[PDB]
Amino acid sequence: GQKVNPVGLRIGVIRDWESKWYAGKDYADFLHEDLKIREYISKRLSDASVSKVEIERAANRVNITIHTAKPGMVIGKGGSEVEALRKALNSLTGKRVHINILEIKRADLDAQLVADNIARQLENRVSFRRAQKQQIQRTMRAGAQGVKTMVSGRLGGADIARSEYYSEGTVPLHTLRADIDYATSEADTTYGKLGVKVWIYRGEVL
RNA sequence: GGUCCGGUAGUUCAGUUGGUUAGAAUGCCUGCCUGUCACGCAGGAGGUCGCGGGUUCGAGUCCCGUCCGGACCGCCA
RNA sequence: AGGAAGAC
RNA sequence: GGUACCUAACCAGAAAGCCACGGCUAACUACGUGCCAGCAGCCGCGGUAAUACGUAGGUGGCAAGCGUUGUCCGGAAUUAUUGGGCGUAAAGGGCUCGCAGGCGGUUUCUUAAGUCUGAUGUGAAAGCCCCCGGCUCAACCGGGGAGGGUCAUUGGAAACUGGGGAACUUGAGUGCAGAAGAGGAGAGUGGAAUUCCACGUGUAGCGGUGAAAUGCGUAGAGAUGUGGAGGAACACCAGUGGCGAAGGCGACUCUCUGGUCUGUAACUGACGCUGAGGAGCGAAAGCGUGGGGAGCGAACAGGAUUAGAUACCCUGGUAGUCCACGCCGUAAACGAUGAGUGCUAAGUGUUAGGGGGUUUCCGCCCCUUAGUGCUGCAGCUAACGCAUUAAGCACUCCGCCUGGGGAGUACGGUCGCAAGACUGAAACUCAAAGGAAUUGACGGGGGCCCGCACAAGCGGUGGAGCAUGUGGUUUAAUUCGAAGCAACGCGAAGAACCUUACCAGGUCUUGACAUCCUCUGACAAUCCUAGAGAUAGGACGUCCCCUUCGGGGGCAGAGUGACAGGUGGUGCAUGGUUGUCGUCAGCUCGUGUCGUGAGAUGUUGGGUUAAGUCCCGCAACGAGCGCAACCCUUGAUCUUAGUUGCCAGCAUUCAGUUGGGCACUCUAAGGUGACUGCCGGUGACAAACCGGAGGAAGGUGGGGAUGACGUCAAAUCAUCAUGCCCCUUAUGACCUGGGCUACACACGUGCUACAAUGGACAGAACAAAGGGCAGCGAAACCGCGAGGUUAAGCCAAUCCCACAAAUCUGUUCUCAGUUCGGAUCGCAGUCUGCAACUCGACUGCGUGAAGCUGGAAUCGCUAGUAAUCGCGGAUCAGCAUGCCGCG
């Protein structure tokens, strides 16, 4: 009884996939293994706040590129992450891996980082309203064309669970050539479990 | 204490008169309508006649003994 | 100026 | 009384509690309890996360005290002179005449009762206050002043209120000249209708309501033309017009009579206003006595309607309504606005006058009163609203209110023939009852508009058999969840055993599931005893890599505690998803105006659209989510791209397979294209609507995807997750068998039919979209059959599923429980699987059931749509009537 997920509605027609390959008659166990890579990358790089990973097959070699938007607390001495990730990933999948990193300039317009920012202030236990206003101000001072933010759950009141919305600019969810970046994040506090949905209208596609 | 009428579906009354084959409402059950109940509308139901004897076209309609009701009389010094 | 219709 | 004080000699040691901590009201956190125990001065708190209950800690107020109770004053402007009100909140007497009472126009003299101001005597002393002194200020004790007086005598002032004398005319009356009136009481007269009676004509119905019926009528009704009787009320004139103090007063004439208004200036000269008690009127209904009684008509009766209907509706109909004489004395007796007087912008009608400008002509204008309206400033109000006919600004007098019930009640009085009228408590109980406005919802309220909503049709549902779900019921369990639309072929896109959670049986304690401590450093499989499960022991039977000989690379096992697991409860502890209203067209914000405020405006109004879609006025101007477009697919063509298609144009063969070539269908990239693009008529020329043309389609071409703010505490703890509960020598685990599929019943959804718009048999057909390597499986052979055999081809525009049926031509049946229909039942099989009894599908037989198109009601359907006919696909070893998709 809600809107259909906009990234899942945009993929295939305007949005290119995050995976660019084919597997025949071994499709199932490649999906199982590369989701094991994606959960392991998420679990060990949640501190480094990856926006997205994207993979490809190189005829029994796999190429991984990871979008993290900062080298600073991520690359270490420069080779530490690539040795500690490439040997570990070789140990897990048993196949030849290659890894590369990419950065996002104007780094406050990426939705997964925005929802992780909101979630991080929720375990930081600053007030949710201050989190919404500060993130709205951060996204407009970075510059954008529209932001809609939602946080639902038990927001400090024990006996009621209600959502809060905060928006600015235009976010049409029904124009197809619109390039909404959408993100859902999950926050665990002593009050309970809180859901964040942020979706950003960055630009236009002709 | 005598006299006269009745004892029928869960309830109230026809069939007691018309010796053959047991009926009408109400109530009960199922379905329909309405969000639900009530109304309302479609179908469905048991009774052998207070208890025992007899006899015939054939005993529920005939009579007797008992029980339960209703009515009348139970007077004269 | 052209039907009676209850209750939660 | 050796008491306070003065000198001293030693000890921080003997000496602090009460209340509160949600808001008022300064001061908060955890644990128990979980509509129980309890708190509470009011709001109210507690039905598993209690800042409101009890603890524990801490804080806050006060302090030798601190709280509760009781009483009084405040805040209470909440009995209001200071200091309230009465249109709608509680509150204007029903209205008049007036006694006592309360107020009084101007001027001029006069007294000093009221008024103001000195003098004297008094209002004792302690008390309050002002200024000083003493006990170690202090509490207190003193010394000197201020008064708590409408106080008594007396002096002074005369403005105002009073007492007196004399003027004045505006307030108020009288006269004189005019005007209007449904003002009242009595007597009389008139016409139209209704009823009743008599007669003439006249046939068969009249009346009545949403249909109806009771009633009246062949003993002559109703209609119709006459003539009498009697009662009531006076059509049009008739007017938000007139008159009256109020109630009220409408036919006309007469007798008597009450007022009102205009003008004058001839008079009297403050005669005035209000009015407690008192007296008098006073709608309708009611009562007593005597009349009258046409119509209407409580009561009452019959007829309906309804579940009942003592009611609305129909037919009758007594008291009453009418007159005279009395009584009662009430109304939403209303302007829900007491009477009187005076000031304060205007506009416009109407009633009765007066005066002026060329008229004694018609009318035209300007003053002018006294009504009677309607708009509308300042001003008032809480808004509505009032506004020279105040609810404005004042002055006098009167009446009345002080929260809602109980109550206009009980008691007690005065009236009354009576019913009742006037006056009118309390005990007790609640924390609200209200007034006016705003936002929604709703209406058997209105106005436009839309949708298979109803209407027009087609085909079904219950009716029969069967399949699959739900409730009930029994069992060892029939695992749970869902419950009107929006649960019930739903989660399940597949239960023989695992699935499986549920039941029975026999078995486990760091367990298969994640990491630390220590070894062996590689573990297992093959056959037995029980074996069905763990287990216990046996035959080879705990068997890698780096290795400065130290040790590591986490796979396998072994013993240990921290442990892990919960498809267990809580969707009303939650995120995450979903349906619904609903593809309905709406939902809001910024800035600014209007409003005391809630709010309003934009977002309403007009014209069209499917739309809050577009445009024109507008205290609005804009913006955002929605709508429409962009996306996908189906609809024609150009270029490129021709194999694993096309065989056109050619030669070849039954396999048209081939030798050769892309123009066509075909697969598909870029496009071309349809967008209000032209004409006419409407529409103020705008936006839009209708009819026309190359066109494949004209007015979003068809369909999909797309589902706003929110509602239903809607559904899911069954993917994951703090919150509690039991375990961890067990609700957690292993397996065997059972159950989820039972069955007197009722329902939801579907399938198959009841047939000759057919059945059976025989022959010719037309070929969409998907799936295929632990597979799809062609040919051929065997088989009265599902199937079996070796098996060519295919990792797919080639090979297989793929043999499409309904369709078209022949014979039969001839209307039947049949050559329909196929369900149950026995026999014999095929396939899958360790295993088809509980509980799979399919085939050959035989058996042939109910059913002859289905009541109340009820469902879907508008340019391939319903209906039929098949075909694939998904979960899966096997199982379709379920679901998805295609023709």
PDB file of C-alpha atoms (C1' of nucleotides) in Angstrom, chain D residues 400-498:
ATOM      1  C1'   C D 400     -35.262  40.563  37.570  1.00  0.00           C
ATOM      2  C1'   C D 401     -30.353  37.060  37.680  1.00  0.00           C
ATOM      3  C1'   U D 402     -26.009  35.015  40.665  1.00  0.00           C
ATOM      4  C1'   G D 403     -23.415  27.106  38.371  1.00  0.00           C
ATOM      5  C1'   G D 404     -26.495  22.377  36.179  1.00  0.00           C
ATOM      6  C1'   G D 405     -29.822  18.851  38.237  1.00  0.00           C
ATOM      7  C1'   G D 406     -33.415  17.873  42.507  1.00  0.00           C
ATOM      8  C1'   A D 407     -37.655  22.043  40.978  1.00  0.00           C
ATOM      9  C1'   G D 408     -40.950  25.770  39.375  1.00  0.00           C
ATOM     10  C1'   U D 409     -41.027  20.415  43.187  1.00  0.00           C
ATOM     11  C1'   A D 410     -42.485  19.386  48.679  1.00  0.00           C
ATOM     12  C1'   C D 411     -44.331  22.086  52.801  1.00  0.00           C
ATOM     13  C1'   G D 412     -47.043  26.593  54.411  1.00  0.00           C
ATOM     14  C1'   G D 413     -50.127  30.767  53.061  1.00  0.00           C
ATOM     15  C1'   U D 414     -53.660  34.107  49.711  1.00  0.00           C
ATOM     16  C1'   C D 415     -57.084  33.396  45.707  1.00  0.00           C
ATOM     17  C1'   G D 416     -60.356  29.319  42.840  1.00  0.00           C
ATOM     18  C1'   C D 417     -66.939  25.934  41.942  1.00  0.00           C
ATOM     19  C1'   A D 418     -62.914  23.097  39.971  1.00  0.00           C
ATOM     20  C1'   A D 419     -58.454  22.237  36.835  1.00  0.00           C
ATOM     21  C1'   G D 420     -55.028  25.214  38.874  1.00  0.00           C
ATOM     22  C1'   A D 421     -52.667  30.438  39.461  1.00  0.00           C
ATOM     23  C1'   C D 422     -49.239  33.633  42.593  1.00  0.00           C
ATOM     24  C1'   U D 423     -45.204  33.191  46.576  1.00  0.00           C
ATOM     25  C1'   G D 424     -41.524  29.207  46.878  1.00  0.00           C
ATOM     26  C1'   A D 425     -36.752  26.034  50.278  1.00  0.00           C
ATOM     27  C1'   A D 426     -33.771  22.071  51.390  1.00  0.00           C
ATOM     28  C1'   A D 427     -31.539  17.200  52.078  1.00  0.00           C
ATOM     29  C1'   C D 428     -28.722  14.935  48.254  1.00  0.00           C
ATOM     30  C1'   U D 429     -25.728  14.851  43.575  1.00  0.00           C
ATOM     31  C1'   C D 430     -22.525  16.475  39.323  1.00  0.00           C
ATOM     32  C1'   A D 431     -17.676  19.384  37.457  1.00  0.00           C
ATOM     33  C1'   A D 432     -19.801  20.800  34.185  1.00  0.00           C
ATOM     34  C1'   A D 433     -24.602  22.990  31.858  1.00  0.00           C
ATOM     35  C1'   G D 434     -24.485  26.700  28.141  1.00  0.00           C
ATOM     36  C1'   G D 435     -24.124  31.298  23.982  1.00  0.00           C
ATOM     37  C1'   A D 436     -22.143  32.599  19.224  1.00  0.00           C
ATOM     38  C1'   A D 437     -18.899  31.211  15.490  1.00  0.00           C
ATOM     39  C1'   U D 438     -14.871  27.477  12.685  1.00  0.00           C
ATOM     40  C1'   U D 439     -13.205  22.803  10.669  1.00  0.00           C
ATOM     41  C1'   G D 440     -14.924  17.874   9.177  1.00  0.00           C
ATOM     42  C1'   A D 441     -18.681  13.955   9.064  1.00  0.00           C
ATOM     43  C1'   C D 442     -23.733  13.029   8.210  1.00  0.00           C
ATOM     44  C1'   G D 443     -29.232  14.049   6.149  1.00  0.00           C
ATOM     45  C1'   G D 444     -35.117   9.441   4.261  1.00  0.00           C
ATOM     46  C1'   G D 445     -31.862  18.345   2.422  1.00  0.00           C
ATOM     47  C1'   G D 446     -30.937  20.974  -2.153  1.00  0.00           C
ATOM     48  C1'   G D 447     -27.756  21.945  -7.208  1.00  0.00           C
ATOM     49  C1'   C D 448     -24.296  19.981 -11.126  1.00  0.00           C
ATOM     50  C1'   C D 449     -20.903  15.662 -12.461  1.00  0.00           C
ATOM     51  C1'   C D 450     -18.650  10.412 -12.854  1.00  0.00           C
ATOM     52  C1'   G D 451     -18.020   4.931 -12.726  1.00  0.00           C
ATOM     53  C1'   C D 452     -21.134  -2.332 -15.895  1.00  0.00           C
ATOM     54  C1'   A D 453     -23.759   1.619 -10.680  1.00  0.00           C
ATOM     55  C1'   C D 454     -28.896   1.153 -12.554  1.00  0.00           C
ATOM     56  C1'   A D 455     -31.126   0.664 -17.111  1.00  0.00           C
ATOM     57  C1'   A D 456     -30.588  -2.723 -22.976  1.00  0.00           C
ATOM     58  C1'   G D 457     -28.686  -7.592 -23.815  1.00  0.00           C
ATOM     59  C1'   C D 458     -25.194 -12.104 -23.411  1.00  0.00           C
ATOM     60  C1'   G D 459     -23.608 -15.996 -20.066  1.00  0.00           C
ATOM     61  C1'   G D 460     -23.435 -17.992 -15.183  1.00  0.00           C
ATOM     62  C1'   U D 461     -23.962 -18.811  -9.295  1.00  0.00           C
ATOM     63  C1'   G D 462     -26.818 -21.741  -6.002  1.00  0.00           C
ATOM     64  C1'   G D 463     -30.489 -27.079  -8.476  1.00  0.00           C
ATOM     65  C1'   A D 464     -27.250 -32.468  -9.607  1.00  0.00           C
ATOM     66  C1'   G D 465     -22.160 -35.152  -9.386  1.00  0.00           C
ATOM     67  C1'   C D 466     -17.099 -33.874  -8.692  1.00  0.00           C
ATOM     68  C1'   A D 467     -12.436 -30.841  -7.323  1.00  0.00           C
ATOM     69  C1'   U D 468     -10.295 -27.360  -3.911  1.00  0.00           C
ATOM     70  C1'   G D 469     -10.622 -23.861   0.615  1.00  0.00           C
ATOM     71  C1'   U D 470     -13.702 -22.117   5.514  1.00  0.00           C
ATOM     72  C1'   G D 471     -16.747 -22.988  10.073  1.00  0.00           C
ATOM     73  C1'   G D 472     -18.808 -26.927  13.173  1.00  0.00           C
ATOM     74  C1'   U D 473     -18.103 -31.738  15.011  1.00  0.00           C
ATOM     75  C1'   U D 474     -14.915 -36.537  16.751  1.00  0.00           C
ATOM     76  C1'   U D 475      -9.953 -38.099  17.366  1.00  0.00           C
ATOM     77  C1'   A D 476      -3.443 -39.079  19.066  1.00  0.00           C
ATOM     78  C1'   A D 477      -2.980 -34.869  16.479  1.00  0.00           C
ATOM     79  C1'   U D 478      -6.466 -33.239  12.716  1.00  0.00           C
ATOM     80  C1'   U D 479       0.400 -27.597  12.951  1.00  0.00           C
ATOM     81  C1'   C D 480      -0.467 -22.342  12.470  1.00  0.00           C
ATOM     82  C1'   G D 481      -2.066 -17.630  10.535  1.00  0.00           C
ATOM     83  C1'   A D 482      -5.869 -15.017   8.096  1.00  0.00           C
ATOM     84  C1'   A D 483     -12.470 -13.306   9.071  1.00  0.00           C
ATOM     85  C1'   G D 484     -17.926  -7.763   5.170  1.00  0.00           C
ATOM     86  C1'   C D 485     -16.575  -5.224   0.777  1.00  0.00           C
ATOM     87  C1'   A D 486     -10.624  -5.133   1.550  1.00  0.00           C
ATOM     88  C1'   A D 487     -10.892 -13.717   4.816  1.00  0.00           C
ATOM     89  C1'   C D 488     -12.775 -18.341   2.586  1.00  0.00           C
ATOM     90  C1'   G D 489      -8.604 -22.646  -5.704  1.00  0.00           C
ATOM     91  C1'   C D 490      -5.859 -17.105   0.574  1.00  0.00           C
ATOM     92  C1'   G D 491       0.186 -17.392   2.652  1.00  0.00           C
ATOM     93  C1'   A D 492       1.052 -22.929  -0.499  1.00  0.00           C
ATOM     94  C1'   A D 493       4.355 -21.377  -7.962  1.00  0.00           C
ATOM     95  C1'   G D 494       2.308 -28.510  -5.542  1.00  0.00           C
ATOM     96  C1'   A D 495       1.741 -32.701   2.257  1.00  0.00           C
ATOM     97  C1'   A D 496       3.234 -40.795   0.488  1.00  0.00           C
ATOM     98  C1'   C D 497       8.031 -40.726   4.052  1.00  0.00           C
ATOM     99  C1'   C D 498      11.732 -35.166   4.795  1.00  0.00           C
TER     100        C D 498
END
